[PDB]
Design an enzyme around this catalytic site. Structure first.
Site, PDB file in Angstrom:
ATOM      1  N   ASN A  90     -61.086 -75.067  60.494  1.00  0.00           N
ATOM      2  CA  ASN A  90     -62.282 -74.841  61.334  1.00  0.00           C
ATOM      3  C   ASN A  90     -61.963 -75.120  62.800  1.00  0.00           C
ATOM      4  OD1 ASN A  90     -64.025 -74.320  58.955  1.00  0.00           O
ATOM      5  ND2 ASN A  90     -63.602 -76.481  58.560  1.00  0.00           N
TER       6      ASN A  90
ATOM      7  N   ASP B 120     -61.600 -76.701  55.281  1.00  0.00           N
ATOM      8  CA  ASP B 120     -62.411 -76.507  54.058  1.00  0.00           C
ATOM      9  C   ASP B 120     -61.453 -76.318  52.883  1.00  0.00           C
ATOM     10  OD1 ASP B 120     -64.573 -76.598  55.804  1.00  0.00           O
ATOM     11  OD2 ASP B 120     -64.912 -74.449  55.749  1.00  0.00           O
TER      12      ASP B 120
ATOM     13  N   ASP C 100     -63.214 -77.118  64.715  1.00  0.00           N
ATOM     14  CA  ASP C 100     -63.304 -78.565  65.052  1.00  0.00           C
ATOM     15  C   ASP C 100     -62.104 -79.348  64.520  1.00  0.00           C
ATOM     16  OD1 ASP C 100     -63.878 -78.612  62.349  1.00  0.00           O
ATOM     17  OD2 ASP C 100     -65.794 -79.649  62.546  1.00  0.00           O
TER      18      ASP C 100
ATOM     19  N   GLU D  80     -67.392 -68.049  49.190  1.00  0.00           N
ATOM     20  CA  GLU D  80     -66.658 -69.098  49.936  1.00  0.00           C
ATOM     21  C   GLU D  80     -65.150 -68.995  49.715  1.00  0.00           C
ATOM     22  OE1 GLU D  80     -67.551 -71.234  52.092  1.00  0.00           O
ATOM     23  OE2 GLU D  80     -69.713 -71.395  51.898  1.00  0.00           O
TER      24      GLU D  80
ATOM     25  N   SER E 233     -61.280 -79.643  61.488  1.00  0.00           N
ATOM     26  CA  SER E 233     -61.499 -79.943  60.061  1.00  0.00           C
ATOM     27  C   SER E 233     -61.005 -78.769  59.222  1.00  0.00           C
ATOM     28  CB  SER E 233     -62.951 -80.233  59.774  1.00  0.00           C
ATOM     29  OG  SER E 233     -63.737 -79.060  59.832  1.00  0.00           O
TER      30      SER E 233
END
Ligand SMILES: [Cl-]
Ligand code: NA
EC number: 3.2.1.17
Length: 129
Positions: A46, A52, A48, A35, A50
């Site tokens: 992302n 991480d 959308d 990750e 958003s």
């Protein structure tokens, strides 16, 4: 901070992740590797809108507040910036909430596609724990 493999395994064990919800330590080290490449400062936007955050790439749509993900939830009750700290306490505590949500570690795309079904104990091989 960029952790070493065994360094991260040791800190993750100290924080109670070994066998948490039945997930052996190697599962968590494997997930962190793919990750974030063991980098607590990793961030990824992302499609959308958003983002991480951190060593386990926790998402702003559900788990943390970054002030720029409209209509998002903050289920770990923390600013997303707390997940970028060299101290992994906040990332570990939020991850314990995510893995208990019903889907286990399938929440992490990279775990499902690169760790699940593999020999994950290899990730802690040679570490003094
Ligand atoms: Cl499970
Ligand atoms: Na949020």
């Amino acid at each position: 901070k960029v952790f070493g493999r065994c360094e991260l395994a040791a800190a993750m064990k100290r924080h109670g992740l070994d066998n948490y919800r039945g997930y052996s330590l190697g599962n968590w080290v494997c997930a962190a590797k793919f990750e974030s490449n063991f980098n607590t400062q990793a961030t990824n936007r992302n499609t959308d809108g958003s983002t991480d955050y951190g060593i386990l790439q926790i998402n702003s749509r559900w788990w943390c507040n970054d002030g720029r993900t409209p209509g998002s939830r903050n289920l770990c009750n923390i600013p997303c910036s707390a997940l970028l700290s060299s101290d992994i306490t906040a990332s570990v505590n939020c991850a314990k909430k995510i893995v208990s949500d019903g889907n286990g570690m399938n929440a992490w795309v990279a775990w499902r596609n690169r760790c699940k079904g593999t020999d994950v104990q290899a990730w802690i091989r040679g570490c003094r724990l």
